[PDB]
Design a protein around this nucleic acid. Sequence first.
RNA 1: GGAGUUAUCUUUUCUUCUUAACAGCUUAUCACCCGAAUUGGUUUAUCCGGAAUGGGGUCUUAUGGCUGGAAGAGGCCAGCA
Length: 98
Amino acid sequence: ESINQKLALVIKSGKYTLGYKSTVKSLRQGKSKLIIIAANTPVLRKSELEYYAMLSKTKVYYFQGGNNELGTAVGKLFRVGVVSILEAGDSDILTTLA
RNA sequence: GGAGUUAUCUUUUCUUCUUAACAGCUUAUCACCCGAAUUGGUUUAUCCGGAAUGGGGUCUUAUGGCUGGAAGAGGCCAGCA
Protein backbone atom coordinates (compact mmCIF):
# COMPACT_ATOMS: atom_id res chain seq x y z
CA GLU A 1 0.00 0.00 0.00
CA SER A 2 0.97 3.58 -0.77
CA ILE A 3 0.05 6.15 1.87
CA ASN A 4 -2.20 8.26 -0.41
CA GLN A 5 -4.57 5.26 -0.72
CA LYS A 6 -4.67 4.97 3.07
CA LEU A 7 -5.13 8.73 3.73
CA ALA A 8 -8.80 8.56 2.68
CA LEU A 9 -9.31 6.02 5.50
CA VAL A 10 -7.66 8.31 8.12
CA ILE A 11 -10.44 10.90 7.53
CA LYS A 12 -13.18 8.64 8.95
CA SER A 13 -12.25 6.64 12.08
CA GLY A 14 -8.78 8.17 12.59
CA LYS A 15 -7.67 11.79 12.77
CA TYR A 16 -5.26 13.86 10.70
CA THR A 17 -4.38 17.55 10.69
CA LEU A 18 -2.64 19.64 8.02
CA GLY A 19 -0.13 22.41 8.49
CA TYR A 20 3.36 23.52 9.50
CA LYS A 21 2.20 24.87 12.91
CA SER A 22 -0.10 21.85 13.24
CA THR A 23 2.79 19.41 12.67
CA VAL A 24 5.19 21.48 14.87
CA LYS A 25 2.74 20.91 17.79
CA SER A 26 2.44 17.22 16.97
CA LEU A 27 6.18 16.46 16.80
CA ARG A 28 7.13 18.50 19.91
CA GLN A 29 4.49 16.95 22.21
CA GLY A 30 4.43 13.72 20.16
CA LYS A 31 0.72 13.28 19.31
CA SER A 32 1.64 12.32 15.72
CA LYS A 33 2.83 8.76 15.16
CA LEU A 34 3.54 9.07 11.44
CA ILE A 35 3.91 12.28 9.40
CA ILE A 36 4.06 12.56 5.61
CA ILE A 37 6.38 15.05 3.89
CA ALA A 38 5.88 15.87 0.20
CA ALA A 39 8.25 17.08 -2.52
CA ASN A 40 7.75 20.82 -3.08
CA THR A 41 7.23 21.82 0.58
CA PRO A 42 9.00 25.20 1.35
CA VAL A 43 12.74 25.53 1.98
CA LEU A 44 13.29 26.10 5.73
CA ARG A 45 9.95 24.91 7.05
CA LYS A 46 10.11 21.44 5.41
CA SER A 47 13.51 20.70 6.98
CA GLU A 48 12.23 21.52 10.48
CA LEU A 49 9.49 18.88 10.24
CA GLU A 50 12.21 16.36 9.34
CA TYR A 51 14.34 17.65 12.28
CA TYR A 52 11.63 17.55 14.99
CA ALA A 53 10.48 14.12 13.77
CA MET A 54 13.99 12.63 14.10
CA LEU A 55 14.41 14.43 17.46
CA SER A 56 11.25 13.06 19.15
CA LYS A 57 11.76 9.84 17.12
CA THR A 58 8.34 10.04 15.44
CA LYS A 59 8.25 8.31 12.05
CA VAL A 60 8.39 10.01 8.65
CA TYR A 61 6.86 8.74 5.42
CA TYR A 62 8.78 10.28 2.52
CA PHE A 63 6.22 10.72 -0.23
CA GLN A 64 6.38 9.80 -3.92
CA GLY A 65 4.56 12.69 -5.61
CA GLY A 66 4.27 16.39 -4.91
CA ASN A 67 2.10 18.64 -2.78
CA ASN A 68 -0.85 18.42 -5.21
CA GLU A 69 -0.87 14.58 -5.04
CA LEU A 70 -0.72 14.76 -1.22
CA GLY A 71 -3.48 17.42 -1.00
CA THR A 72 -5.96 15.49 -3.17
CA ALA A 73 -5.35 12.45 -0.93
CA VAL A 74 -6.70 14.41 2.08
CA GLY A 75 -9.05 17.05 0.65
CA LYS A 76 -8.18 20.69 0.02
CA LEU A 77 -7.11 22.65 -3.06
CA PHE A 78 -3.84 24.11 -1.76
CA ARG A 79 -0.30 22.81 -1.92
CA VAL A 80 -0.40 20.52 1.13
CA GLY A 81 3.17 20.09 2.32
CA VAL A 82 2.54 17.72 5.21
CA VAL A 83 -0.16 15.46 6.61
CA SER A 84 0.20 14.75 10.33
CA ILE A 85 -1.52 11.42 11.10
CA LEU A 86 -2.44 11.31 14.79
CA GLU A 87 -4.66 8.22 14.81
CA ALA A 88 -4.85 5.55 12.09
CA GLY A 89 -8.41 4.25 12.47
CA ASP A 90 -9.51 2.36 9.37
CA SER A 91 -6.14 2.85 7.65
CA ASP A 92 -3.96 -0.18 6.87
CA ILE A 93 -0.82 2.01 7.13
CA LEU A 94 0.14 0.24 10.38
CA THR A 95 0.21 -3.24 8.80
CA THR A 96 2.45 -2.22 5.86
CA LEU A 97 5.49 -3.31 7.90
CA ALA A 98 3.28 -5.91 9.65
C1' G B 1 -21.67 95.45 2.74
C1' G B 2 -23.10 98.82 -1.47
C1' A B 3 -25.99 100.67 -5.95
C1' G B 4 -31.37 100.32 -9.02
C1' U B 5 -28.71 102.90 -14.54
C1' U B 6 -28.97 108.95 -18.86
C1' A B 7 -34.51 105.24 -21.55
C1' U B 8 -40.00 102.55 -20.35
C1' C B 9 -38.67 100.15 -15.60
C1' U B 10 -36.46 97.35 -11.46
C1' U B 11 -33.83 96.84 -3.69
C1' U B 12 -34.34 87.96 -2.52
C1' U B 13 -30.93 91.80 -9.61
C1' C B 14 -25.82 92.07 -10.38
C1' U B 15 -21.03 92.66 -8.48
C1' U B 16 -17.22 92.78 -4.79
C1' C B 17 -16.01 90.26 -0.24
C1' U B 18 -15.79 85.01 1.50
C1' U B 19 -7.60 83.88 3.76
C1' A B 20 -2.85 81.90 5.76
C1' A B 21 4.52 77.99 6.15
C1' C B 22 5.02 73.88 10.90
C1' A B 23 4.48 70.22 14.51
C1' G B 24 1.48 67.04 16.68
C1' C B 25 -2.63 63.95 15.38
C1' U B 26 -2.53 59.20 12.63
C1' U B 27 -4.77 56.08 6.87
C1' A B 28 -3.75 52.34 1.69
C1' U B 29 0.01 48.72 0.53
C1' C B 30 3.63 44.62 2.91
C1' A B 31 4.99 40.48 6.22
C1' C B 32 5.98 35.22 11.36
C1' C B 33 -0.61 35.45 9.39
C1' C B 34 5.20 32.50 6.36
C1' G B 35 1.65 29.00 8.55
C1' A B 36 -3.41 27.96 7.35
C1' A B 37 -9.06 25.61 9.91
C1' U B 38 -12.33 29.10 7.78
C1' U B 39 -14.22 32.64 3.89
C1' G B 40 -14.39 39.54 3.82
C1' G B 41 -12.91 40.97 -1.49
C1' U B 42 -18.25 41.90 -8.84
C1' U B 43 -15.28 37.61 -8.47
C1' U B 44 -12.74 32.19 -11.50
C1' A B 45 -9.17 32.40 -5.83
C1' U B 46 -5.03 27.36 -3.41
C1' C B 47 -5.09 33.43 -2.11
C1' C B 48 -5.54 37.06 1.78
C1' G B 49 -9.60 39.36 5.95
C1' G B 50 -14.21 39.68 9.48
C1' A B 51 -13.45 35.10 12.62
C1' A B 52 -10.19 31.20 14.48
C1' U B 53 -5.52 28.91 15.57
C1' G B 54 -0.01 28.45 17.37
C1' G B 55 5.07 29.87 20.39
C1' G B 56 4.38 34.08 24.00
C1' G B 57 2.37 36.90 20.12
C1' U B 58 1.25 41.14 16.21
C1' C B 59 4.19 45.38 13.47
C1' U B 60 6.19 48.91 9.80
C1' U B 61 5.15 52.63 5.59
C1' A B 62 1.15 56.39 4.56
C1' U B 63 -3.24 60.57 -0.17
C1' G B 64 -6.68 62.90 3.48
C1' G B 65 -8.58 64.51 8.29
C1' C B 66 -8.08 66.29 13.18
C1' U B 67 -4.96 69.83 16.22
C1' G B 68 -1.37 73.62 17.27
C1' G B 69 1.05 78.29 15.65
C1' A B 70 -2.19 83.17 15.28
C1' A B 71 -2.72 86.60 22.56
C1' G B 72 -2.34 88.22 16.69
C1' A B 73 -2.54 89.97 11.10
C1' G B 74 -5.20 91.28 6.17
C1' G B 75 -9.60 92.75 3.59
C1' C B 76 -15.45 94.62 0.56
C1' C B 77 -16.28 99.55 2.82
C1' A B 78 -16.01 104.27 5.80
C1' G B 79 -14.76 108.20 9.74
C1' C B 80 -11.67 112.64 10.89
C1' A B 81 -7.52 116.16 11.19
